[PDB]
Write a protein that binds this ligand. Sequence first.
Ligand SMILES: C[C@H](CCC[C@H](C)C(=O)O)[C@H]1CC[C@H]2C3=CC[C@H]4CC(=O)CC[C@]4(C)[C@H]3CC[C@]12C
Lengths: 242, 13
Amino acid sequence: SYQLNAAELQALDLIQEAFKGMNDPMEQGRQATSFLKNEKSPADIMNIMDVTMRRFVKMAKRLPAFNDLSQDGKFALLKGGMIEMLTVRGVRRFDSSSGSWTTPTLGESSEVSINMFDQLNADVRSEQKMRFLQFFKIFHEDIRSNDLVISMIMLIVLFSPRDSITDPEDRRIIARHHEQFSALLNRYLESLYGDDAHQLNEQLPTALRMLREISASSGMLFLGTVNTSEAEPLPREFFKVE
Amino acid sequence: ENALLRYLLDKDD
Ligand SMILES: C[C@H](CCC[C@H](C)C(=O)O)[C@H]1CC[C@H]2C3=CC[C@H]4CC(=O)CC[C@]4(C)[C@H]3CC[C@]12C
C-alpha cells in the first residue's frame, strides 16, 4: 500500500546515481585550503561555495530529466535555482549545537561557522543569518539528515517554473518534473512513516516559499566584502561583490 | 552574463 513499487525504487536509484560525486573529497587547491583555514574571510566562503556550485552543475548533467531540456532551459534553471539548492545543502550539512557547517569527507574539526555571516554586507547580513536559522529550524532532525529527501528537495527546487523560460516544450518538461519529484518525495516519506508522512508533505510548500525568500534576499550579501583576485569566479556570478 | 556557468553546463565532464 505505502511500500515503494519498482518504478519508484528505480526513480530513487537514478537520483542517487546522479548525486554521486556530491560527497567526494576535495582535491588540493584554493577551495580546499579555504575550507581548512581556521580564520575564514568572505573570499574563503566564496571559494567554498564554488565547490558545491560546480558539483550541482555536474549532478544536473547526470540526470535524464535535466537532459530533456534545451541548453538555454538548462542554463535558466541552474541560474535561477543555484542559491536555493546551496541553501538546501546548507540544511543537510548544518549542526545547531556546534553552530557550523561540515563536509562529509572531512572530520567535524574542519567547518564553517554560522558566524561567517557577521563578516558579510552589514546592510543585510544579520537578516540573512536569521533567515537561514529560521529555515533550518523547520526541519525534523531525521528528515534534514536524509540524503534522499534532501536530494529530492534540491530537484524540486531546480525544476521550478521560471518566467525566463519561454520555450513551450521546456516549460512543459519543467512543470511535469516539478510534480513528479514532489510526488516521489511524498511516496518515499509514506514508505518510511506511513500516515505520519502527511504532515511532512504539507510542509513542502512552506519550505519552497522560505527558500525562494532566502534566494531573493541573498544577492547583495557579499557586496564590498571581497577582493576579486582572492575569490573564485563562479560564485561571483551569483553574488555581486562590486 | 554568467559565462562560466554556461561554460560548465555545456562542457564534457
Ligand atoms: C554547504 C556549505 C558547506 C559545505 C561545503 C562543501 C564543499 C560541501 O558541499 O560538502 C556552506 C558553506 C557556506 C554556506 C552558505 C553561504 C552563503 C549563504 C547565504 C544565505 O543567506 C543562504 C545560505 C548560504 C547560501 C549558505 C549555504 C551553505 C553553505 C554553502
